[PDB]
A paper describes a structure:
The enzyme pyridox(am)ine 5′‐phosphate oxidase (PNPO), whose catalytic action yields PLP, is one of the key players in this pathway. In humans, the different B6 vitamers, introduced with food, are interconverted through a salvage pathway which involves, besides kinases and phosphatases, the enzyme pyridoxine 5′‐phosphate (PNP)/pyridoxamine 5′‐phosphate (PMP) oxidase (PNPO) (di Salvo et al., 2011, 2012). This flavin mononucleotide (FMN)‐dependent enzyme, which produces PLP from PNP or PMP, plays an active role in vitamin B6 homeostasis. In both human and E. coli PNPO, PLP works as a regulator of its own production because it binds at an allosteric site of the enzyme, affecting the binding of substrate at the active site and inhibiting the catalytic activity (Barile et al., 2019, 2021). Mutations in the gene encoding PNPO are responsible for a severe form of neonatal epilepsy.
On the basis of this previous experience, we carried out co‐crystallization attempts with either the wild type or the R225H variant of the human protein and PLP. The R225H variation affects a crucial active site residue involved in substrate binding, but is able to bind PLP at the allosteric site and has allosteric properties (Barile et al., 2020). We obtained crystals with both protein forms; however, PLP was detected only in the active site of the wild type protein, thus a clear indication about the location of the allosteric site was missing. A substantial part of the N‐terminal end is not visible in these structures: the electron density map starts from Glu46 in the R225H and from Ala47 in the wild type structure. PLP binding at the allosteric site of E. coli PNPO results in the disorder of the large structural region made by residues 123–166 and also uncoils a short helix (residues 192–200), which contains Arg197 (corresponding to Arg225 of human PNPO) that plays a crucial role in binding the vitamer substrates at the active site. Our crystallographic analyses and the results concerning the proteolysis of PNPO N‐terminal region indicate that this region of the protein is very flexible.
Residue numbers in the entry:
A (entry chain A), B (entry chain A): 46 to 234, 243 to 261
Amino acid sequence: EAFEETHLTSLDPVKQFAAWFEEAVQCPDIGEANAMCLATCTRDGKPSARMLLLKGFGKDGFRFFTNFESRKGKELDSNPFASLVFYWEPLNRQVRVEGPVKKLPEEEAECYFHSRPKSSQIGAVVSHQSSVIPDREYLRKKNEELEQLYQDQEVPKPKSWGGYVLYPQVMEFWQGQTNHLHDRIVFRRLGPMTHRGEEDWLYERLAP
Amino acid sequence: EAFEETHLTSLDPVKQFAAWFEEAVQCPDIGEANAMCLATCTRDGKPSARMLLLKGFGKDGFRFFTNFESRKGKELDSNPFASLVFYWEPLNRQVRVEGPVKKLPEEEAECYFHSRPKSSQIGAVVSHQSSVIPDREYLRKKNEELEQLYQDQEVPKPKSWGGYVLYPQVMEFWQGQTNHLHDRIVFRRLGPMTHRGEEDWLYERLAP
Ligand SMILES: Cc1cc2nc3c(=O)[nH]c(=O)nc-3n(C[C@H](O)[C@H](O)[C@H](O)COP(=O)(O)O)c2cc1C
Ligand SMILES: Cc1cc2nc3c(=O)[nH]c(=O)nc-3n(C[C@H](O)[C@H](O)[C@H](O)COP(=O)(O)O)c2cc1C
C-alpha cells in the first residue's frame, strides 16, 4: 500500500519510470499507458498544453513526434523547455517530467515516420497542424487525393514533421492515498533531507 | 460520428463545454470527468503541469483550489496565466482552455473549504504543499496530532489555501477520428474562415 523510499525500485528515476510504466501497460483498465500531457510556453511566458503519446524513452530522455510548424513546435523552437504529466487513474499515480528539448536527428525521424501506418503517414502531409482551414471536407478531399498520388508508393516525410527528446532534469513520482497524504518523491539534477540517487540525481520527499 | 460546426450545441464555448462535460459524467467508463491537467510557467518561461480537479465552472470561468505557497501558486502569483486540458479517453475527446487567472474571494474559499470532508480539511493544514519534508511518517504524525486538536471542532482555513478562476480567452474542442482527421473547433476572444459566436467569441477550424 505505502509507497516507500526504501521500497521503490531504482535510484535512477528513468528506471523507476520503466517500473511504473510496465505496471501501467499490465493494467487492463488503462487504454494508452503512454498518453501524456505536454506543457510548453512562449519565451514571454504564455503556457499551453495538449495530449501527446510517448514514442520511446531511455537514458537520453523521452521522445515524441509532431509538426514543427505547429503551435507547440514554434513554442519549442523559440523556448526549448517542456513539462510532461503521466496520469494513470486506476493505479492512482502521476509522473511529472521537466527538462530541455532537443530536436531529434532527421534520418531518425525518417525511420520512424515510415514505420507508422500508411493512413497516418498521409495524414501528416495533408495536415498543416494547427493552421486555420475552411471546413472538415477540405481535409477529407485533400486526403483522398493524396491516397491516389501515393498509390503503391511511399510517403516522403514532410520537412515540418519530426521528433523531439526531453532530457529530464526533474522527475516527480506521485502516489495518491485515501488519507490524502499523497506520497511524492522528486528527483532533480547536501541538506539533511536531500538524498543521493544514481549519477547526479538527488531525491527528496514533498508535502502533498 | 462527425463532429460538425452546424451540429455542435452552442456558439458559446462555455455552454458547449457544459454539453461535453455532461456526456463525460454520463459515461460510466469515466472516473473523474472533472480531472484536468493545469499548465503554468514562470515569468521567465519555465513550464510546469500537474493534475487538478475542476471545482465548478460558469460565465466567470473555471474554478480550482490549491495552496498559494505551492510551486504552482507562486507561478500564478507572479505570472497569472494558465492552460487546462480535459481528456476523456472513452469518448476520445479533448478540451483545451487558456486565459488569465484571478484569485477567488477569501470568504468564498472559506465557504468551500468547510464543505470538504473533515479529513480533507485537516490535510490542508498539515501539508505545506510542495515543501521538502524528511519522511512520510512526519506527515502521518502531525496529521493524527491535528485530529486531536480539532476534535469536535471546525478546522480554520489556512491563509495559504484558497481558490482561483481562469477567465477563458481560448477554448479548443478536439474530437479524434479513426481516419486521423481529428475535428478541431477553437473559440477565441473578420477573415473568410473566421466565424462569429456568442458575445465576443470567434471560432475557426484547425488542421489536426
Ligand atoms: C491521446 C492523444 C494523443 C495525441 N498524440 C499526438 C502526437 O503524438 N503528436 C501530435 O502532434 N499530436 C498529438 N495529439 C493531438 C494534440 O493534442 C494537438 O491537437 C496537436 O498536436 C496540436 O497541438 P498544438 O496546437 O499545441 O500545436 C494527440 C491527441 C490526443 C488526444
Ligand atoms: C487526479 C488528481 C487531482 C488533483 N487535484 C488537486 C487539487 O484539486 N488541488 C491541488 O492542490 N492538488 C491537486 N492534486 C495534486 C497535484 O497534482 C500536485 O501534486 C500538487 O498540487 C502540487 O503541485 P505543484 O507542485 O505544481 O505546486 C491532484 C492530483 C491528482 C492526481
